[PDB]
Design an enzyme around this catalytic site. Structure first.
Site, short mmCIF file in Angstrom:
data_model
loop_
_atom_site.label_atom_id
_atom_site.label_comp_id
_atom_site.label_asym_id
_atom_site.label_seq_id
_atom_site.Cartn_x
_atom_site.Cartn_y
_atom_site.Cartn_z
N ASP A 93 82.65 -61.75 47.06
CA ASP A 93 82.45 -63.06 46.87
C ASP A 93 83.24 -64.33 47.03
O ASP A 93 83.36 -65.44 47.01
CB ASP A 93 80.90 -63.37 45.96
CG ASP A 93 81.72 -62.58 44.26
OD1 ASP A 93 82.05 -61.45 44.40
OD2 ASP A 93 81.46 -63.30 43.77
N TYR A 116 47.51 -16.04 43.69
CA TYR A 116 46.09 -16.15 44.15
C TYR A 116 45.10 -14.66 43.80
O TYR A 116 44.33 -14.55 44.56
CB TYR A 116 46.11 -15.72 45.39
CG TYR A 116 46.65 -17.20 45.68
CD1 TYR A 116 48.49 -17.55 46.84
CD2 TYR A 116 46.13 -18.30 46.32
CE1 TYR A 116 48.07 -18.09 46.91
CE2 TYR A 116 46.04 -19.69 47.54
CZ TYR A 116 47.32 -19.05 46.98
OH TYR A 116 47.97 -20.51 48.40
N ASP A 138 49.42 -28.11 43.45
CA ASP A 138 48.72 -27.35 44.27
C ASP A 138 48.49 -25.83 43.32
O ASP A 138 47.81 -26.69 41.77
CB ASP A 138 49.41 -26.42 44.78
CG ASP A 138 49.10 -25.11 46.17
OD1 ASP A 138 48.53 -25.16 47.13
OD2 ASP A 138 49.38 -24.65 45.04
N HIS A 167 47.78 -32.69 52.06
CA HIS A 167 48.43 -31.54 50.55
C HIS A 167 49.24 -31.84 50.21
O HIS A 167 49.96 -31.92 49.31
CB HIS A 167 47.63 -29.68 51.23
CG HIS A 167 48.19 -28.46 50.93
ND1 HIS A 167 47.67 -29.72 49.62
CD2 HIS A 167 49.65 -28.33 50.28
CE1 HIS A 167 48.25 -28.67 48.32
NE2 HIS A 167 48.94 -27.84 49.20
O1 LIG Z 1 49.02 -29.40 56.27
C1 LIG Z 1 48.89 -28.97 55.55
C2 LIG Z 1 47.47 -28.39 55.96
S1 LIG Z 1 49.02 -27.02 55.04
C3 LIG Z 1 47.91 -26.59 53.37
C4 LIG Z 1 47.72 -25.51 52.67
C5 LIG Z 1 47.30 -25.00 51.18
C6 LIG Z 1 46.38 -26.62 51.07
CL1 LIG Z 1 45.57 -26.82 49.41
C7 LIG Z 1 45.98 -27.47 51.96
N1 LIG Z 1 46.62 -28.05 52.95
O1 LIG Z 2 46.68 -22.62 48.01
C1 LIG Z 2 46.13 -22.57 45.96
C2 LIG Z 2 45.14 -24.09 46.85
S1 LIG Z 2 45.55 -24.46 45.10
C3 LIG Z 2 44.49 -24.08 43.18
C4 LIG Z 2 44.14 -23.44 42.41
C5 LIG Z 2 43.18 -22.50 42.12
C6 LIG Z 2 42.69 -21.47 42.16
CL1 LIG Z 2 41.81 -20.41 41.62
C7 LIG Z 2 42.88 -21.64 43.88
N1 LIG Z 2 43.55 -22.38 44.47
#
Ligand SMILES: OCCSc1ccc(Cl)cn1
Ligand SMILES: OCCSc1ccc(Cl)cn1
Ligand SMILES: OCCSc1ccc(Cl)cn1
Ligand SMILES: OCCSc1ccc(Cl)cn1
Ligand SMILES: OCCSc1ccc(Cl)cn1
Ligand SMILES: OCCSc1ccc(Cl)cn1
EC number: 3.3.2.10
Lengths: 541, 541
Positions: free
Chosen positions: B179, B460, B329, B518
């Protein structure tokens, strides 16, 4: 023969008991005796309080149910609040320090210790106070069994069988301390040694008699130390070949601890829990050349200019705009340079033993070093490989000979060059100093096995480089909050060496430790902690 | 042909210029024109200001010397303060966002960028403000050259030769923006491309024309991301076989980020600098089973009860009485359980996509999972080894097929069992999603090479275990600060699934992201950052 001690929380490990408040409230408000205390226990095992204590409902769900019970028990005043009464009571409740000291002493003597408590799931906006108390208390015990977590409650006999199972001990091996006679009975009825707690002193006389261990009138205990494997270990890459390691504990303003030669983050073991407990986020470093931090071989990698630039990058990478810097020995020097060259990144600055001395532009630093007899060992450290060979020959001998109190020393640091070494008039098997355990020596031994003494010694090998850099700051003053802590008996970093500091740091604050040698932190941990916490709370937010 | 861009700080990267204040002060106080501005430059290269700019003296030492220069230049008012004027001016100066965006775009297109500034050593009690600004600005550039650090000053020609040397580029390869016409001249005189900065837009039109790169009217940029090797990496042992890894950035209240399946601390790359910049200490975890965190093989090591107990130990070991927990998630589920079982250790709670759903005591969790077609993939994940084999066969394929925006998907999560796998109707070489670079895919690939999918999949494999534990909290409510963030296009964790949350969390706050799949964090980073920072500043101190 006893091997485990169990303590209640309310009325035992924490005082004043929350029950003592229900009574005090009735008295202050001239309410009928036990009006509030009877409302608290309405319905017994079926009532709101048992459901709360078993974890069926949270404390905030229970508040209006207690409000209903006190209405049916009774007339009540205008702005009467169960929330306010419990908030005040919980907040007033503090750790019963002598009871915790006894539990610490029993654990130190081989006992398994545990807290067994009838408590609730606390979801009040002010739940952090209690969260904090439990966090501090629990870490001193092998087990913490909470009624609301186990779905059981005292006096039901299943919680006692649960207690004996977690402890993996028969009832005759267990002492149980409780302020409630009813909660004490099932433990007694099972064959456990029981102590009814009223006043702490009587309870501790009973506990001493029953365990055969002195717990009352004991000499002052050392601060809480660190077990390396129980810490959070952090790693930041400051440049392609350089990663710095640090141990991290607490929340609040960031406090960066910088050790000296030949040390470790572990040299701050007695300060780390103390400062975290005081409300600070502690970052205890392994300085470049040390422990799990990188140790490049090049001398120039250890000049103050680069060491300081890397500590600024360390902050940048951790996302810290500032930290308070506290240093000892060579770390104390680094910390004065952080303050002079990067005041914006230093919240406050403190040094143990190391004074701030401006560079002399009219004298060579190696002339200046030669002028002070006690700094002879620094000339012995110049020649690459000589001191590495002696210091690396026997690590255990190195640390046991170095780490000694002022009334124990085996080392004179003048006439080291003439003598041909640091340990030439020193025993092959030095005795263990009162400051350290064999295990603590062995931690330093294991740390130094990785890189040895080359990187650490290189800190001394940049005299001329550091002097030229330092000469750039000769017109400056240190005007940020600053603490200088002197040690009466440091025979190298003498308190007198700090005498002209207020010429360059006019608002300097001071601390002084009598009968303290070079190894300040482990020599006088209690006082170091008191001086640092006091200065931190007054000068560094 | 250009390859480097150099920017001044005052009037270029930061506005309003501090010179603009010296003029505005004269005007507001009806002082003779340029009275203060002439005092600021009194003595020229010999004067107090040059010594300040060269680093000879600190800002606090210069304050009274400027006070003397303004007295000799002039009558002055009653309570006139140079300190107050400079304090206000520095505090008012903010980053020139469009100028920083242009420097970021040039660096993204292969340029070497640098800040060249005439600045001082700031030791004012309020130096943190400036320290912060520089810390934020500097990390976006290859070099930061400060007059007070290099002992040189603009317009002296040596600072330009110093500039060309650090850049390792000939003057014709360099654009220089300033400046001040006088500071611009030596760069021009040496053959560097120069731009005189008045208004930013004109300066950027000149910069666009000269570089051939679009910098003005550019589409909205993504938030600042993380380079893994430039972070502070932390490690805490929570139990003998379990160590948890985390990335750490910033100071302030602790914010614990908890990713989902199959992710990394790196899934929060766009949130970590943003939240640290907003005044928070971010701890981005590698959840148990992931990256540099331990991954034991046993199924039961991954039930919510143990996962939560380990996260409490993580805090205990770091010395944190509380943290705000933010999850996505599977991390979103963990975070609701931290809030229910350990409210004292949770400052506030936030979830992205994962709703809070109470356990159904009248229905088996595997009956409940069977009731929702989109949760079929979770039944496919039950049998130990089946999903590990498919997910580990080709890592690059796994992440490229999974990590896709709502308008890109190659995966349907219903009829996965019947189909015999997650990727059975998926290409062998999926195209790269707009959300990720090849390099970002390759980071997840390298992370998953260490332990693979067994520990992640085990999250899971605890349905019945988690359901029994969860049934203990059926009488409770979440009464601490809580945020639920829904994603319009998450076809598994549908926004509708969160519809009854205020039954158990009455004071719940909400966020909602339209056209978001997601992978919330990398899909819509800008909005995630806006919703989280806004809720953090209002509800979590
Ligand atoms: O790209 C989106 C589909 S992949 C996907 C994986 C997990 C959960 Cl909970 C939801 N979608
Ligand atoms: O892909 C996982 C989605 S998040 C999720 C959370 C809780 C339970 Cl019991 C199952 N899935
Ligand atoms: O043993 C190291 C004592 S501390 C120290 C600090 C600075 C200088 Cl130049 C020398 N020694
Ligand atoms: O045990 C005390 C003597 S060893 C020692 C080592 C270094 C310094 Cl600066 C002072 N003393
Ligand atoms: O050249 C500047 C360093 S002067 C100095 C400062 C402190 C100690 Cl303990 C020894 N020497
Ligand atoms: O058994 C209690 C877990 S119920 C549940 C909660 C959240 C999601 Cl996404 C799926 N299932």
């Amino acid at each position: 023969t006893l091997r485990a001690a169990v303590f209640d929380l309310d009325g035992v490990l924490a005082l004043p008991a929350v029950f003592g408040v229900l009574g005090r409230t009735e008295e202050a408000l001239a309410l009928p005796r036990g009006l509030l205390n009877d409302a608290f226990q309405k319905g017994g095992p079926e009532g709101a309080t048992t459901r709360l204590m078993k974890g069926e409902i949270t404390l905030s769900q229970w508040i209006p149910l207690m409000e209903e019970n006190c209405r049916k028990c009774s007339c009540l005043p205008k702005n009467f609040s169960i929330k306010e009464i419990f908030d005040k009571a919980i907040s007033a409740r503090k750790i019963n320090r002598p009871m915790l000291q006894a539990a610490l002493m029993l654990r130190k003597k081989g006992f398994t210790t545990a807290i067994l408590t009838n408590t609730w799931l606390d979801d009040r906006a002010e739940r952090d106070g209690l969260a904090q108390l439990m966090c501090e208390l629990k870490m001193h015990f092998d087990f913490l069994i909470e009624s609301c977590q186990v779905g059981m409650v005292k006096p039901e006999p299943q919680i006692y069988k649960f207690l004996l199972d977690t402890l993996k001990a028969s009832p005759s091996e267990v002492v149980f301390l409780d302020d409630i006679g009813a909660n004490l009975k099932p433990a007694r009825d099972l064959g456990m040694v029981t102590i009814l707690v009223q006043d702490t002193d009587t309870a501790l006389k009973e506990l001493e008699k029953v365990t055969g261990i002195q717990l009352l009138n004991t000499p002052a205990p050392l601060p809480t130390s660190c077990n390396p494997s129980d810490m959070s270990h952090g790693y930041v890459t400051v440049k392609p070949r350089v990663r710095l390691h640090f141990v991290e504990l607490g929340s609040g303003p960031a406090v960066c601890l910088c050790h000296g030669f030949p040390e470790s983050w572990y040299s701050w073991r007695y300060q780390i829990p103390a400062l975290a407990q005081a409300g600070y986020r502690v970052l205890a470093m392994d300085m470049k050349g040390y422990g799990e931090s990188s140790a490049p071989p090049e001398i120039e990698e250890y000049c103050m200019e680069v060491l300081c630039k890397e500590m600024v990058t360390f902050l940048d990478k951790l996302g810290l705009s500032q930290a308070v810097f506290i240093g000892h020995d060579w770390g104390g020097m680094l910390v004065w340079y952080m303050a002079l060259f990067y005041p914006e990144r230093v919240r406050a600055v403190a040094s143990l033993n190391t004074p701030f001395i401006p560079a002399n532009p009219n004298m060579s630093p190696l002339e200046s070093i030669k002028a002070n007899p006690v700094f002879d060992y620094q000339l012995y450290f110049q020649e690459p490989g000589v001191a590495e060979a002696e210091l690396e020959q026997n690590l255990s001998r190195t640390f046991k000979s170095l780490f000694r109190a002022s009334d124990e020393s085996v080392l004179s640091m003048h006439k080291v060059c003439e003598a041909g070494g640091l340990f030439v008039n020193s025993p092959e098997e030095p005795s263990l100093s009162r400051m350290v355990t064999e295990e603590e020596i062995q931690f330093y031994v294991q740390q130094f096995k990785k890189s040895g003494f080359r990187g650490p010694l290189n800190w001394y090998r940049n005299m001329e480089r550091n002097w030229k850099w330092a000469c750039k700051s000769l017109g400056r003053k240190i005007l940020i909050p600053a603490l200088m802590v002197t040690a009466e008996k440091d025979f190298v970093l003498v308190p007198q060496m700090s005498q002209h500091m207020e010429d360059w740091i006019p608002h300097l604050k001071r601390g002084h430790i009598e009968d303290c040698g070079h190894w300040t932190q482990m020599d006088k941990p209690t006082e170091v902690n008191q001086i640092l916490i006091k200065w931190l709370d007054s000068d560094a937010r």
